């Protein structure tokens, strides 16, 4: 049910980490302060990789057209994005980050 | 938004109206007649700046924005309706459902993650009185009656009309139509003589300002409009003078018409009775783009049976359409076009020098500014823009 | 402010001139010939970007702005002169007196409070030498002589001409005309051979800068202009060479012409003698809008009586008009058109690379910048603006 | 500088590309065929927004900017080549050497200090494979090989083609040509049936994104391009379905073409083999201005001797040109034109909704942004600007 | 009949405007600038707007229709698009009661 | 070879003096603070006299089109000027200004 991402220490606050999954679409893990979040890595407005975008607080900005989403709710924050991003469960147990292979 | 803020700041009584260069969003608009759209033959049109496609399936009308979500081309460039309920873009074959606009298939890549995850804009469409109305707005539409003048939808009311594209902003058309004193441009209309009409050259106002009109915001159906009451206390002018000498006379015919005139949002005029004592005229000035509008004319006449409808139909074709809709209203067309230059730079909205009868126009401007359901913007046309 | 300030700041010697894209206000300008407008025959024209109407009443000319004060339409769309001394807008019948532009009546409402309290802009008009001059300015006009080249108004000077609309800004027309070296484009004119003219290919300047021209700002009638004196110390060029080899020669005719050339505000050139040793040419480049001008051509020749006048008129129609005004000046027309692109974005005023003979043009640019009577702006066209 | 900064700010992956609406400076571009320009007959054309003049002297081609340094007129309005090695402006006779653009003489003033002190812009020109290439750039030009697809310059490669002006920005043309899924618009081409081509409707991608293309960052000659590898691990789509039902089929011909497709800077596509297993197609989309481009098509086929060349030329004129270059590519023309509106306001660069096969286009946009040799700006056209 | 009773000077705060309706005549507008009272026609000369519904800024009244303005003391235009001067009506306070003239002032028998 | 132009005090700081030379193009001598420089007087972009221009630091601004040059190197500083100005070394000795007869 869960996948190993990395150690909480490996990610500095305000950074993003792409998680490639065998036989499945990639995910993106974001560290906002001391809390971690995860969504699909592919922007819903096209084919861009959000892990290659810019994180400002809890909002991720797509590198392609500047669209944006809230990494917590997956809801669009900036146009042209309109389709909600898939949000996946994340939990930090024993100084290690884990992401739910399935979306909430 | 659409106009220089320095200008809007100056117009304190109706800035929203001045800003509404592209028309009001979230209102129903007639764009064509039912007989012009046939089963399975998608038709194109531009409404409020937006390119749209209308199709008839199993007798029902559907409206999809005529712009593919992919590379933004018009699907109409080469229509490909491969199944009854869908339309396939000719470029990369993205396929959309007419009923909800959902991207249901992509022939060039049936495994695309975009399938089922994107939706092309659709607009509500309703046919009434043989007229096709499109709700150019968002969310569930309000009843059509809200955006139609009183009696247009009367069961016994037989509606016949004409539609064409005119080169002027919709507001110029509206104001010209509701303008009490513009009646002067109709003094030589063939309808005046040929239909023995009584028609003054203008009006000498009477009573106070508020008595010049009746602002309607208490309509049960929610209609918002204004009635021109200049004739209740005013003296009609039948002898025009210059330096005290009579230089022109109004028409002293026997038929009394147009004693009941009203304008309603989003921009439809009702003239009763006209062009004959037993008829009414309902005309819309629908925004196509900032420089053009559809001049959707319709004449209504109570009819109880097919015999009456056929008779009226014959009269419309042989008399009313050519003598009134054209013979009378044609002068309105070039009159509207004549105001384009003065308002084109938006400066006319500041420099215009109004006189008494324009009180009706002022009332309309204020009502429109206060009761419109939204201001259409170029961003609506290209794609809404908002930064977190 | 008709030009980007960044550009104007760069042009220290003649910024006002570069900014005068629409021409100079408060000057007299010829717009048509007297015989072109007859009694009660209203004529429309655009001058300095303003739409005007001219009419002849009891022989006298009057000029009114072709724009109703009410809704800004052009009165000329459907002219209505119901009384000898007035014009009535075709829209709501506001009526103005040609004599002073006063709104004296309103047929649609004889009780209107606007009556007698509004005045439509009027402009002084004067006829001289068969030419119609309009003072496009405010206040009492100065003598017409101030805006005409010397001798144009001489008692015996018979004036004949031609006028047309040319597609180029007025300044390009002025500079081409006063351009000493542009004479090169006329080397193959039919007039050169057919009238045995002596015509150089150009000039090799001599002496210092101040000697190339004579700036006139001491003329008693107040006219302001510049004389091209490149030929006083310069050697005319009759043998054009490339790599020291003669590839073209000038014309060695016997008739000497154009050894006295001057340009005067608001923009009229005087070439003397031309196109014949006993004649003079005076031509105006009148601003219609930023992209067009009237090329008002006139040829003057002293005549003592109706006999000589008639003879001249016959020579004008059979020779001078076709051989000179057209056969010679037609090349000036496309030459002006060829500079449009370079200056259309206003960048040419910065990027142009001038050579010696352009000293004459520079002198004119500075004189115009310093002595023009005002810069016409878009605000004059739409309506002057000013906030408390 | 060519696009609203607020838009460029949003496009972090290829802002330079979106900004390059006028094209990339400092690259070679084909503009015509050698047979189109003969000895001593100057020809005009516009490239990257600049008006140019090309002339053949002693068999060799030379290129000068078609704009006089003096008053900015096009020399071509009236061509005056008075000596074999020069061109004289028709206005004031400034004369330039075709060889280096130096202002060597001025017929209107042989004593001018400008002589020998100014230089009209010249551009390198090279003829290859019967095609005329111009290096629209500054400084010493790189080998033509850098800006041409692999093999175009092969000794035995016989090149034949066609050129025309198309109304769309060059980038829309480039992307359409390299678009893997656009093959759908070609499903009914006469070439598919008449040349028995196997042609799918599209592709269902396979493998990771990195495997969808192959970027070439450097060649022995510095070439910069991208190969479309969607067919490497992708599944060709031969049956188009909607709701699970087959509504269209690809073409099941025997000839397999377009083994490899690649796009190269400055913007030239190579399809191999095409339209026949033994031929190749090389096509440029050359920027003329922001709204148009030259669609320079060429078909290459190795030929060992005059005998094979003659035959090929016969087959080209009788079959390939009409059936492929026109019968196949004509659909590409209107597809490009169909994308104009969406990108015309630059907003399409933000609102486009891309899908999987667009990885090819994205790779090209990034390669173009990263390796172009310069962004052509309107300032290059009017004259570079810089304030101290 | 020469002077029309308007109201008590105390019924008007500094910087306010009051409309005065007259039988068989056009309405007037009385302005209080500090403790001084001025008056002009109420109808803006540029249209049909009521200046008493505008905004007073010092001694300048701004029309609510198009933003034009006038100096309430001289009636002269202060802001475009207004160009026609307002008719001015003398105001006087007798016994704390505000009175406005029934006839506008003229360039007759006054300063040269 | 040198040309005695004038006394240093004949020029106020920040001014320009035109130096005519029979049978040769005129030069422009600039006084920047207490330093003196010289170049050809004719703007290389046209016929303007740089001596009638505006000096800003060691940059002379042409009065015609706003083009500019560095009076020390003669290199263009502002468009539309593109052709380098001829420069002449200047030396002040005993309160007298001398300018090289030929460019250098
Ligand atoms: S692909 Fe993310 S904003 Fe367009
Ligand atoms: S533009 Fe419609 S499917 Fe690509
Ligand atoms: S526009 Fe002229 S009277 Fe109304
Ligand atoms: S514009 Fe070419 S020589 Fe003057
Ligand atoms: S009505 Fe007062 S400013 Fe126009
Ligand atoms: S003449 Fe000096 S910048 Fe043009
Ligand atoms: Fe009408
Ligand atoms: Fe000429
Ligand atoms: Fe294609």
Work out the angle at residue A36's Cα, subtended by the Cα atoms of residues A35 and A40, and round it to the nearest 5 degrees: 150
Chain B partners within 8 Å of E66 (Cβ)? 10-11, 349-352
Q: Which of A74, A21, A25 is nearest to A49 (CA)?
A: A25
Tokens representing B380 are 């609506």
Residue C279 in domain: yes
Could you tell me if C31 and C120 are in contact, meaning their C-beta atoms sit under 8 angstroms apart? no
List the CATH number of the domain containing C185.
Answer: 3.90.380.10
Work out the angle at residue E58's Cα, subtended by the Cα atoms of residues E56 and E64, and round it to the nearest 5 degrees: 20
Work out the angle at residue C154's Cα, subtended by the Cα atoms of residues C148 and C159, and round it to the nearest 5 degrees: 75
List the CATH number of the domain containing C104.
Answer: 2.20.25.10
Shared-domain flag, residues B155 and B130? no
Size (chain A), residues: 104
Shared-domain flag, residues D36 and D16? no
Chain A partners within 8 Å of B385 (Cβ)? 79-80
Domain ranges within chain E, ordered by starting residue: 1-112
Residue D82 in domain: yes
Chain C partners within 8 Å of B354 (Cβ)? 70
- Shortest CB distance from C113 goes to which of E26, E57, E62? E26
Q: Among all chains, which residue has been given the structure tokens 């560290």? A: A31
- Shortest CB distance from D114 goes to which of C182, C339, C355? C355
Question: Measured in angstroms, how far is the CA atom of residue B176 from the centroid of ligand 7?
Answer: 7
Shared-domain flag, residues D337 and D220? yes
Question: Measured in angstroms, how far is the CA atom of residue B316 from the centroid of ligand 7?
Answer: 19
| Closest listed ligand to the CA of F60 | 6
The CATH code belonging to domain E1-112 is: 2.102.10.10
Residue nearest atom 1 of ligand 3, based on CA coordinates: C71
Phi, then psi, of C333 in degrees rounded to 5: -60, -55
In angstroms, rounded to a whole number, what is the distance separating the alpha carbons of residues B369 and B33? 29
Decide: B362 in ligand 2 pocket, CB within 6 A.
Answer: no
Chain C partners within 8 Å of B179 (Cβ)? 92
Cα–chain center distance at B20 = 14
Range of the domain at B73: 66-120
In angstroms, rounded to a whole number, what is the distance separating the alpha carbons of residues C327 and C333? 11
Q: Where are the beta strands (DSSP E) in A1-104?
A: 2-7, 15-19, 27-32, 35-40, 54-56, 59-61, 68-70, 76-78, 88-92, 96-103
| Closest listed ligand to the CA of B324 | 7
Check B110 against D237: CB less than 8 A apart: yes
To 10 degrees, the CA torsion angle through B72, B76, B81, B84? 100
- Compute the half-sphere exposure of residue D115: CA atoms within 13 Å on the CB side of its CA: 18
In angstroms, rounded to a whole number, what is the distance separating the alpha carbons of residues C300 and C304? 13
Q: For residue D219, how many other CB atoms are within 10 A of its CB? A: 13
Decide: E46 in ligand 5 pocket, CB within 6 A.
Answer: yes
Check D93 against C345: CB less than 8 A apart: no
Resolution of the experimental model in angstroms, please? Answer: 2.0
Check F66 against C358: CB less than 8 A apart: no
Decide: B184 in ligand 2 pocket, CB within 6 A.
Answer: no
Q: Counting atoms of ligand 5 from 1, which one is nearest the CA of E44? A: 2
3-state SS of chain E? CCEEEEEEHHHCCCCCEEEEEECCEEEEEEEEECCEEEEEECECCCCCCEHHHCEEECCEEECCCCCCEEECCCCCEEECCCCCCCCECCEEEECCEEEEECCCCCCCCCCC
Shared-domain flag, residues C245 and C322? yes
Beta partners for residue D122, in sequence order: D64
Q: Is any Cβ of chain B less than 8 angstroms from the Cβ of A27? A: no
Q: b vs e for D96-114, b when ≥16 Cβ sit within 10 Å of the residue's Cβ?
A: bbbeebbbbbbbbbbebeb
Q: Counting atoms of ligand 5 from 1, which one is nearest the CA of E81? A: 3
Residue C205 in domain: yes
Could you tell me if C269 and C179 are in contact, meaning their C-beta atoms sit under 8 angstroms apart? no
Could you tell me if C376 and C290 are in contact, meaning their C-beta atoms sit under 8 angstroms apart? no
Question: Measured in angstroms, how far is the CA atom of residue B379 from the centroid of ligand 2?
Answer: 21
DSSP state, C138? S
Q: For residue F46, how many other CB atoms are within 10 A of its CB? A: 21
Work out the angle at residue B274's Cα, subtended by the Cα atoms of residues B268 and B280, and round it to the nearest 5 degrees: 55
Residue C388 in domain: no
Tokens representing C372 are 């023009």
Chain C partners within 8 Å of E80 (Cβ)? 383-387
Tokens representing D68 are 């006089």
Residues with Cβ within 8 Å of F42's Cβ and at least 6 positions away in sequence, in order, are D113, F25, F26, F48, F49, F50
Phi, then psi, of B30 in degrees rounded to 5: -80, 140
Does C98 belong to an annotated binding site?
A: no
Residue C331 in domain: yes
Phi, then psi, of A37 in degrees rounded to 5: -135, 165
H or E element that contains D80: none
Shared-domain flag, residues D192 and D294? yes
Decide: E66 in ligand 5 pocket, CB within 6 A.
Answer: yes
Please state the residue numbers annotated as binding site of A for [2Fe-2S] cluster. 43, 45, 62, 65
Question: Measured in angstroms, how far is the CA atom of residue C298 from the centroid of ligand 9?
Answer: 61
The nearest alpha carbon in chain D to C244 belongs to: D105
Residues with Cβ within 8 Å of C375's Cβ and at least 6 positions away in sequence, in order, are C2, C16, C19, C20, C22, C24, C25
Q: Is any Cβ of chain C less than 8 angstroms from the Cβ of E57? A: yes
Q: For residue D236, how many other CB atoms are within 10 A of its CB? A: 15
Q: Counting atoms of ligand 3 from 1, which one is nearest the CA of C68? A: 2
Decide: B75 in ligand 2 pocket, CB within 6 A.
Answer: no
The topology under which CATH files domain F1-104 is Rieske Iron-sulfur Protein (2.102.10)
Chain D partners within 8 Å of A64 (Cβ)? 11-13, 354
Phi, then psi, of B260 in degrees rounded to 5: -135, 100
Shared-domain flag, residues D152 and D164? yes
Residues with Cβ within 8 Å of D259's Cβ and at least 6 positions away in sequence, in order, are D272, D273
Q: Is any Cβ of chain A less than 8 angstroms from the Cβ of B111? A: no
Residue D388 in domain: no
In angstroms, rounded to a whole number, what is the distance separating the alpha carbons of residues B267 and B263? 7
Residues of C at the D interface, defined by Cβ within 8 angstroms:
179, 181-185, 201-205, 237, 240-243, 245, 247-248, 334-335, 338-339, 341-343, 345, 347-348, 350-357
What is the domain count for chain C? 3
Q: Which of C44, C69, C41, C70 is nearest to C57 (CA)?
A: C41
Distance from CA of B94 to the nearest CA of A (A): 14
Shared-domain flag, residues C227 and C104? no
List the CATH number of the domain containing C55.
Answer: 2.20.25.680
Q: Is any Cβ of chain D less than 8 angstroms from the Cβ of A86? A: no
Grouping H, G, I as helix, E, B as strand and the rest as coil, residue C158 is: strand
Q: Cis link prior to D275 (omega < 30° from 0)?
A: yes
Check D11 against A64: CB less than 8 A apart: yes
Chain C partners within 8 Å of E60 (Cβ)? 388
- Shortest CB distance from C13 goes to which of F63, F79, F80? F63
Shared-domain flag, residues D258 and D197? yes
Grouping H, G, I as helix, E, B as strand and the rest as coil, residue B98 is: coil
Check F78 against D388: CB less than 8 A apart: yes
Q: Which of D279, B379, D72 is nearest to C175 (CA)?
A: D72
Does F81 belong to an annotated binding site?
A: no
Residue D15 in domain: yes
Chain A partners within 8 Å of D351 (Cβ)? 65, 80
Could you tell me if B119 and B100 are in contact, meaning their C-beta atoms sit under 8 angstroms apart? yes
Shared-domain flag, residues B149 and B256? yes
DSSP state, B34? G
Question: Measured in angstroms, how far is the CA atom of residue B296 from the centroid of ligand 7?
Answer: 14
Work out the angle at residue D304's Cα, subtended by the Cα atoms of residues D299 and D305, and round it to the nearest 5 degrees: 100
Could you tell me if D56 and D39 are in contact, meaning their C-beta atoms sit under 8 angstroms apart? yes
Shared-domain flag, residues B44 and B134? yes
Residue to mutate, B67, B77, B89, ligand 2, most ligand atoms under 8 Å from C-beta: B89
Distance from CA of B7 to the nearest CA of E (A): 9
Mutate to test the interface with B, among D171, D355, D361, D362 (most CBs of B within 10 A): D355
Q: Which of F21, B170, A76, A73 is nearest to A62 (CA)?
A: A76
Distance from CA of E76 to the nearest CA of B (A): 18
Tokens representing C176 are 């081409």
Residue B388 in domain: no
Question: Measured in angstroms, how far is the CA atom of residue E32 from the centroid of ligand 1?
Answer: 60
- Shortest CB distance from D12 goes to which of A45, A46, A63? A63
- Shortest CB distance from A68 goes to which of B113, B117, B388? B388
């Amino acid at each position: 049910i869960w996948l190993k991402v990395c150690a909480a220490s490996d990610m500095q606050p305000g950074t993003i980490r792409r998680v490639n999954r065998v036989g499945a679409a990639p995910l993106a893990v974001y560290r906002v302060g001391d809390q971690f979040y995860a969504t699909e890595d592919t922007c819903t407005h096209g084919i861009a990789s959000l892990s290659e975008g810019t994180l400002d607080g809890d909002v991720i900005e797509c590198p392609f057209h500047g669209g944006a989403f809230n990494v917590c709710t997956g809801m669009p924050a900036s146009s042209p994005c309109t389709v909600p991003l898939g949000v996946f469960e994340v939990e930090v147990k024993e100084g290690e980050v884990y992401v739910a292979g399935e979306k909430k | 938004a659409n106009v220089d803020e320095a200008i809007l700041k100056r117009v304190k009584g109706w800035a929203p109206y001045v800003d509404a260069k592209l028309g009001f969003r979230n209102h129903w608009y007639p764009v064509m007649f039912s007989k012009e759209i046939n089963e399975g033959e998608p038709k194109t049109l531009k409404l409020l700046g937006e390119n749209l496609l209308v199709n008839r399936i199993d007798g029902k009308l559907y409206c999809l924005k005529d712009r593919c979500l992919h590379r933004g081309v018009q699907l109409s460039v080469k229509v490909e309706c491969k199944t009854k309920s869908t339309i396939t873009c000719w470029y990369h074959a993205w396929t959309y459902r007419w009923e909800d606009g959902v991207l249901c298939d992509i022939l060039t890549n049936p495994t695309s993650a975009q399938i089922g995850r994107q939706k092309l804009k659709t607009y509500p469409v309703q046919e009434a009185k043989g007229c096709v109305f499109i709700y150019l707005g968002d969310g569930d539409p309000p009843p059509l009656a809200r955006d139609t003048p009183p009696n247009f939808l009367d069961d016994d009311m037989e509606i016949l009309g004409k539609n064409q594209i005119i080169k002027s902003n919709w507001r110029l058309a509206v104001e010209n139509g509701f303008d009490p004193s513009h009646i002067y441009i109709h003094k030589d209309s063939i309808l005046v003589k040929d239909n023995d009409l009584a028609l003054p050259l203008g009006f000498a106002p009477g009573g106070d300002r508020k008595q010049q009109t009746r602002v309607v915001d208490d309509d049960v159906v929610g209609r918002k409009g204004v009635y021109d009451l200049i004739g209740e206390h005013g003296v009609p002018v039948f002898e025009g003078t210059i330096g005290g000498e009579v230089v022109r006379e109004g028409a002293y015919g026997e038929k009394i018409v147009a004693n009941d005139v009203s304008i309603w949002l989003p921009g439809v005029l009702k003239v009763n009775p006209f062009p004959n004592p037993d008829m009414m005229q309902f005309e819309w000035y629908v925004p196509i783009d900032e420089n053009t509008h559809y001049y959707f004319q319709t004449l209504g006449k109570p009819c109880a049976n097919d015999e009456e409808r056929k008779k009226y139909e014959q009269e419309f074709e042989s008399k009313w359409k050519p003598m009134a809709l054209e013979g009378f209203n044609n002068d309105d067309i070039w009159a509207r076009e004549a105001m384009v230059d003065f308002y084109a730079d938006d400066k006319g909205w500041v420099n215009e020098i109004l006189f008494e009868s324009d009180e009706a126009i002022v009332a309309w401007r204020k009502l429109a500014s206060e009761h419109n359901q939204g201001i259409q913007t170029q961003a609506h046309v290209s794609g809404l823009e908002h930064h977190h």
